[PDB]
Design a binder for this molecule. Structure first.
Ligand SMILES: CO[C@H]1O[C@H](CO)[C@@H](O)[C@H](O[C@H]2O[C@H](CO)[C@@H](O)[C@H](O)[C@@H]2O)[C@@H]1O
Ligand SMILES: CO[C@H]1O[C@H](CO)[C@@H](O)[C@H](O[C@H]2O[C@H](CO)[C@@H](O)[C@H](O)[C@@H]2O)[C@@H]1O
Ligand SMILES: *[C@@H]1O[C@H](CO)[C@@H](O)[C@H](O)[C@H]1NC(C)=O
Ligand SMILES: *[C@@H]1O[C@H](CO)[C@@H](O)[C@H](O)[C@H]1NC(C)=O
Ligand SMILES: [Ca+2]
Ligand SMILES: [Ca+2]
Ligand SMILES: [Mn+2]
Ligand SMILES: [Mn+2]
Lengths: 239, 239
């Protein structure tokens, strides 16, 4: 596979190219609802949902020292009745057989096991997190504010920028990887022009295997919110 | 899925996004060898191989009357010691669960069952065939010359154009579907400029289900040749 691209303007109840994990489901409004809701659509405690595209990405080739670039765009909104809604949504990249770790329903965002969430040698994941919950006695790795973070094999972000959750409002995001500069760049905006930018230098060939899957994860622990993925496009080329 | 694209500059022995059926395999020269070879690489009798991309294409949407377009490019060469090498290679589109029919190793090109190969109501397939074998007492549906054909639910092509097989030589092909004119167009060239063109009006929403897979099939019966797929790119958008 030397190039791969796909897009979801919205999400289809009869989709065939998504792997659904945990509580992820497609709503009647063509929204990918990652986390569990009750019969009235209200968010509930202790839930993880994830999606991965069924098509795998060749991120690099050992035999030839080629590396892929990628560009991905997505939009989402979060809703909750709580003053401290939790826990957040992340774009992520992981080995193709990745599954939801035990104990990941909460501040580990469906990406990490509590026993190894800070142990880089035990993980293989790149994530861009939109983290709404930062209580310092439970999310001890977090900054003391809502934030966007680039995560490399750890729930402790390598880089963060302060971010403002806006109840019910859509955030649009562009994430790119440049293999020649080994840079992940993140740009996120709200419709009124409020902008967030974050970057981190990481050689993805050192943290991920040759073939990966890409997708999204979200979770709630004892505090909760819906995590509503509205759209997603992805392009990759193996230079 | 509102758009899907992928490409193979050549073929990877460690590919992850191809469904291999029958004798299809990837050679040490990064060639997709569809049909069976012996230990010396020589083609053998009575073999079918097919590949399908693992990602499914939404060809149309019943709920919304949207229809996809697609453009696909590929190249292949055929090799054989015989005066009458057989049987040919086809690009095809079929339901996602499609498998090799029994008795398809020969002039049915790995696409049809002998009992229903001419019964349109029993099939769901669009194929563009490159047919090298036309003996009139066994391939009774064929023109009496080598040909490119557009096949709609039948091994008897809806449209044909005379074509010249060239031993060991690469043919480059572009196939497109225009949903507004419901036209399949085929253009094939050899490096010296020799050109072949063929088109056929067929409403794909009337012959194929909403979700399909795309790929290639080749077969040999009592006469034989290798069917060597060199490259393949595919793009589709659901307008
Ligand atoms: C009200 O819940 C907060 O206080 C509790 C007691 O200190 C914590 O157990 C609780 O942590 C869990 O919920 C959060 C938010 O969903 C989650 O981030 C964390 O991983 C735990 O699941 C929370 O701090
Ligand atoms: C020498 O084989 C030709 O003559 C035989 C006797 O008439 C046929 O059985 C034979 O047909 C089978 O092979 C061809 C070529 O591979 C294939 O197109 C056909 O479907 C049969 O498998 C062939 O005509
Ligand atoms: C980190 O994880 C690896 C693999 O599970 C393990 O060998 C190592 O001991 C762990 N480190 C700590 C400090 O637990
Ligand atoms: C064609 O196929 C259909 C479905 O298998 C069958 O009902 C029909 O009788 C077939 N026609 C003939 C002439 O065999
Ligand atoms: Ca957190
Ligand atoms: Ca034939
Ligand atoms: Mn965080
Ligand atoms: Mn024919």
């Amino acid at each position: 596979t030397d190039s791969l691209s796909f897009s979801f303007i919205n999400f289809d109840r009869d989709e065939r190219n998504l792997i659904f994990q945990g509580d992820a489901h497609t709503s009647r409004n063509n929204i990918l609802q990652l986390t569990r809701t009750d019969s009235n659509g209200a968010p509930v405690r202790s839930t993880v949902g994830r999606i991965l595209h069924s098509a795998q990405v060749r991120l690099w080739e050992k035999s030839t020292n080629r590396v892929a670039n990628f560009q991905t765009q997505f939009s989402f909104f979060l809703s909750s009745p709580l003053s401290n809604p939790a826990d957040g949504i992340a774009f992520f990249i992981a080995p193709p057989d990745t599954t939801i770790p035990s104990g990941s329903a909460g501040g580990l965002l469906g990406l990490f096991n509590p026993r190894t969430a800070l142990n880089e040698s035990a993980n293989q994941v790149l994530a861009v997190e939109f983290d709404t919950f930062f209580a310092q006695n439970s999310n001890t790795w977090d900054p003391n504010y809502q934030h966007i973070g680039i995560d490399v094999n750890s729930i402790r972000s390598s880089k963060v920028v302060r971010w403002e959750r806006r109840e019910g409002k859509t955030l649009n995001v562009l994430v790119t990887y440049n293999p020649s500069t080994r840079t992940i760049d993140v740009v996120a905006t709200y419709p009124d022009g409020q902008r967030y930018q974050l970057s981190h230098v990481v050689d993805l060939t050192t943290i991920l295997p040759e073939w990966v899957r890409v997708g999204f994860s979200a979770a709630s622990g004892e505090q909760f919110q819906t995590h509503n993925l509205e759209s997603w496009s992805f392009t990759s080329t193996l230079l």
